[PDB]
C-alpha cells in the first residue's frame, strides 16, 4: 500500500500472482461495436427504452419483446469481433495465469477470442439455450435463432407463451455455473475488474469474495461500486479508456509484441 500498475505487472512477471480471476462488463465490448446501456444517437434511443435496464426486465419484455430481440439479432452471428481486451484475457489463459473469467456480457466474444468454456462463467446467461416464459419448458437456442434472425417472436409449441433465450433478466436467478465462484474466489491471488460499473448484484458482490491479502486491479473509466465504497490497502485503479489501461499493463508485462502477433493471426481468421 499503495500498489501501482507497475507493481501488479511485476507480481505477474515474478509469477507471485498465478491464479488470476477476472470480472468483465459491457465496458470491454464497446470497442468491438456492442452497445452498453449505461452509456453513451443514444444507445437507449436506438433501442427505444424508457430507461437502460428495461431491456432485461420481464414486465417490459412481456409488454414489448422487440427491443430485446433486436439486440438478440445483432449478437447471434459473428457480426462483432473480439478487441484487444479479449485477446489480453486469452493471452493470460495461454500463459497459465487465468483461473477463471466471470463475464456479465452475452456477446460471446470471450469464446471467440479462444478462451475455453471450462475457463468461462457467463454469469448473465447465454443464447445457447432458451426457456418458455410461462411453462418453463427448455429448448436448445438454435430452435429460436431462426425466429429471431427472421424478426419473429418465438412461441412455445405447448403453452403458446413467449420463448426467451437464457439471458438472466432482473429478478431471475443466475446460472448454476455462477456457483463456481465459491471455489474460485478463495483460490484467487489476483483479481482484475475490467470495463464494469459493478451496478448489478449479485455479480458486483464478488469483488468482496477474495482474501484481504489479494490485490484488486480495476481498469475502468472511473472508480466504482464496492471498490469505491469499501476500498482495501492492495487495491489499484487504472482509470481511463479500458483498452488504454490494458495496453499500458501489457507493455509493463513485456507482452506487446506477443499481443500484436496474437491479435493479427486471430483477426486474420475472422
Amino acid at each position: 500500500g499503495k500498489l501501482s500498475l507497475q507493481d501488479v505487472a511485476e507480481l505477474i512477471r515474478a509469477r507471485a500472482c498465478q491464479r488470476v480471476v477476472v470480472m468483465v462488463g459491457a465496458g470491454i465490448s464497446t470497442p468491438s461495436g456492442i452497445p452498453d446501456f449505461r452509456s453513451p444517437y443514444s444507445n437507449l434511443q436506438q433501442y427505444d427504452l424508457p430507461y437502460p435496464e428495461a431491456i432485461f426486465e420481464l414486465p417490459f419484455f412481456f409488454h414489448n419483446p422487440k427491443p430485446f430481440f433486436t439486440l438478440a439479432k445483432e449478437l447471434y452471428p459473428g457480426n462483432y469481433k473480439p478487441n484487444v481486451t479479449h485477446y489480453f484475457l486469452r493471452l493470460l489463459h495461454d500463459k497459465g495465469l487465468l483461473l477463471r473469467l466471470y463475464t456479465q456480457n452475452i456477446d460471446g466474444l470471450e469464446r471467440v477470442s479462444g478462451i475455453p468454456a471450462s475457463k468461462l462463467v457467463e454469469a448473465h446467461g447465454t443464447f445457447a439455450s432458451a426457456t418458455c416464459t410461462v411453462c418453463q419448458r427448455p429448448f436448445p437456442g438454435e430452435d429460436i435463432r431462426a425466429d429471431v434472425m427472421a424478426d419473429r417472436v418465438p412461441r412455445c409449441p405447448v403453452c403458446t407463451g413467449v420463448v426467451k433465450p437464457d439471458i438472466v433478466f432482473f429478478g431471475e436467478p443466475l446460472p448454476q455455473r455462477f456457483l463456481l465462484h465459491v471455489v474460485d474466489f478463495p483460490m484467487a491471488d489476483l483479481l482484475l475488474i475490467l470495463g464494469t460499473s459493478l451496478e448489478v448484484e449479485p455479480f458486483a458482490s464478488l469483488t468482496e469474495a477474495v482474501r484481504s491479502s489479494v490485490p484488486r486491479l480495476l481498469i475502468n473509466r472511473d472508480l466504482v461500486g464496492p471498490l469505491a465504497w469499501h476500498p482495501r490497502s492492495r487495491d489499484v485503479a487504472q482509470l481511463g479508456d479500458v483498452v488504454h489501461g490494458v495496453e499500458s499493463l501489457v507493455e509493463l508485462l513485456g507482452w506487446t509484441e506477443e499481443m500484436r502477433d496474437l491479435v493479427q493471426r486471430e483477426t486474420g481468421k475472422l
Binding site: 429478478g171 443466475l174 458482490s205
Partner: peptide, 7 residues
C-alpha cells in the same frame, strides 16, 4: 439470490 441493481 437473484439479479438486482446494487444499493
Amino acid at each position: 439470490r437473484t439479479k438486482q441493481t446494487a444499493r
